[PDB]
């Protein structure tokens, strides 16, 4: 009898006793673009009142919370759920098609069959974590000296490098690696070039950090990747 | 001891383990003789778990044996759920078997305790394999009435 | 339909083997009985049959496209005059 | 694009559904006695690769 909106108890307050109001037809569904009733309550004294933002047809076809839109089974954003878990196909993003899908899905879904069962949801969660753990575990000579000497003069089967003392992996990994070798200024990097250049407040920290040497390095777009292919022949 | 079950999907043939558990099969035999099972829904279908049915009301509760309310089961060690098709009975307590039964679709070694085993389906197993693929609502209940037309004992 | 039947080539090595093999161990129900047969739902053919399906369909389509194909100012007027000629020339 | 491009994108007007985000009216075939099952799910790779 237009009784309740579905809200999880994380954003329903830690009090088992709360009061809320409804304003019928108070907003257009942010997905259905449909006239829907609003519900306002207080999570806890001292913060701004919450309110429901999506209709009852949604957050049910999505099995989600009308206010926080965290999925009611796992508790992480429904967008990330449908992007990574990929349980069942979602709707479009354009206006007319999205509202058409919302209307027809609400119709065929109130006919009685449920579009969301949690058994397959947990199965897909375990499948995703399994795939994650699975993820966890003369032509070369001519493209070698073709341009290295050119740049070296301009601004400076097997190949073995030299070690000099002249005075997938994000950048924060570099940040928490060099912090014990001296203060950091900026870490400029590029995955394609695979070259990460750091700067310190003093050259003494740089030289003491570089002395730790015996995967590591010591001192256009495609134009910077010529020496990155040396990784294939390192 | 032999009972043919003219179910709605097809034909189920069952042989009763009179030699193993005599008391639990006599009621079934005389119950097929009376044949009040006509027009009884298979109210419960769980994929790869069971197909339960046998109640006149069709609400998943009730069903009177010849003893009238309930009887005492008899179990022995060599009975096991090692296969897919064992015909067993249904209960809701220590010794509370009623007129309904079910057919196994998978090894259930954890269910061989308070639960009696009294049948092995010799033919019509395909029918149960398809019963495992029946339209089911949120509860383990088929949407359309999965009645049994009629059953002869033979 | 009966033209298509006239262009059919049945009786491969499959049908006789299917008639003779599973009939020997017919403990219950016959392979040809269909009053209460269940397996006919799950008949998934082989590659050769589907291939001949596609070639027959393509040949028939090509056959259709093959057989299907100054009093006037334009080509439509021409087609209209030929229609007029078809209907009124008798009168 | 021949020499050096800024990756030109074609311009859409403001009031079209664009017919390129999903099926324009999104109607699925009715399911019948014979189960499709594998006929499309065994060959999702085909649905992408014939394309």
């Amino acid at each position: 009898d237009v009784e309740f909106p579905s809200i999880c108890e994380r954003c329903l307050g830690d009090n088992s006793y709360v009061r809320m109001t409804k304003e019928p037809l108070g907003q257009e569904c942010k997905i259905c673009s449909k006239p829907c009733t609003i519900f306002r309550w207080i999570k806890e004294r001292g913060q701004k009142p919450g309110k429901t933002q999506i209709c009852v047809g949604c957050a049910r076809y999505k099995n989600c919370c009308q206010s926080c839109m965290l999925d009611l089974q796992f508790g992480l954003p429904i967008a990330l759920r449908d992007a990574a878990l990929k349980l069942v196909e979602s709707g479009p993003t354009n206006d007319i098609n999205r509202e058409f899908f919302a209307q027809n899905q609400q119709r065929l879904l109130s006919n009685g069959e449920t579009a969301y069962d949690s058994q397959e949801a947990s199965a897909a969660a375990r499948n995703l974590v399994k795939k994650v753990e699975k993820r966890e575990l003369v032509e070369s000579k001519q493209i070698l000296k073709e341009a290295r000497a050119s740049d070296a003069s301009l601004n400076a089967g097997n190949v073995s490098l030299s070690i000099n003392m002249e005075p997938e992996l994000a950048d924060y990994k570099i940040r928490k690696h060099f912090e014990q070798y001296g203060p950091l200024k900026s870490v400029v990097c590029s995955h394609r070039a695979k070259c990460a250049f750091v700067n310190f407040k003093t050259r003494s920290s740089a030289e003491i950090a570089a002395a730790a040497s015996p995967l590591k390095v010591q001192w256009g777009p495609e134009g910077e990747v010529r020496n990155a292919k040396l990784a294939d022949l390192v | 001891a032999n009972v043919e079950l003219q179910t709605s999907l097809g034909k189920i043939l069952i042989e009763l383990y009179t030699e193993h558990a005599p008391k639990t099969c006599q009621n079934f035999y005389t119950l097929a003789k009376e044949g009040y099972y006509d027009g009884v829904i298979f109210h419960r279908v769980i994929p790869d778990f069971v197909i339960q049915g046998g109640d006149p009301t069709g609400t998943g509760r009730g069903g009177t044996s010849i003893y009238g309310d309930k009887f005492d089961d008899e179990i022995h060690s060599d009975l096991h759920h090692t296969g897919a098709g064992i015909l067993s009975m249904a209960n809701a307590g220590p010794n509370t078997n009623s007129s309904q039964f079910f057919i196994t679709l998978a090894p259930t070694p954890w269910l061989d305790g308070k639960h009696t085993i009294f049948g092995r389906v010799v033919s019509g197993l395909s029918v149960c394999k398809r019963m495992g693929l029946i339209r089911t609502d949120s509860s383990d209940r088929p949407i359309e009435p999965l009645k049994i037309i009629k059953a002869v004992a033979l | 339909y009966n033209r298509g039947i006239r262009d059919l080539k049945p009786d491969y090595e499959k049908y006789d083997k299917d008639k003779k093999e599973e009939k020997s161990k017919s403990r219950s129900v016959a392979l040809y009985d269909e009053a209460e047969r269940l397996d006919w739902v799950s008949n998934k053919p082989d590659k050769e049959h589907v291939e001949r399906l596609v070639e027959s369909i393509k040949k028939q389509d090509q056959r259709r496209l093959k057989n299907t194909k100054i009093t006037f100012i334009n080509e439509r007027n021409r087609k209209f005059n030929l229609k007029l000629q078809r209907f009124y020339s008798k009168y | 694009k021949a020499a050096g491009i800024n990756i030109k994108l074609f311009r859409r007007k403001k009031n079209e559904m664009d017919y390129n985000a999903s099926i324009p009216f999104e109607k699925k075939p009715a399911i019948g006695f014979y189960d499709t099952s594998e006929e499309d799910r065994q060959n999702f790779r085909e649905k992408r690769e014939a394309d």
Partner: peptide, 21 residues
């Protein structure tokens, strides 16, 4: 095995002895 009912239930032995419905 996770197929659910991806297809309609097969025809029924109707109560009027009709073989297939």
């Amino acid at each position: 095995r996770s197929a659910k009912s991806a297809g309609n239930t097969l025809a029924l032995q109707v109560t009027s002895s009709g073989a297939v419905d």
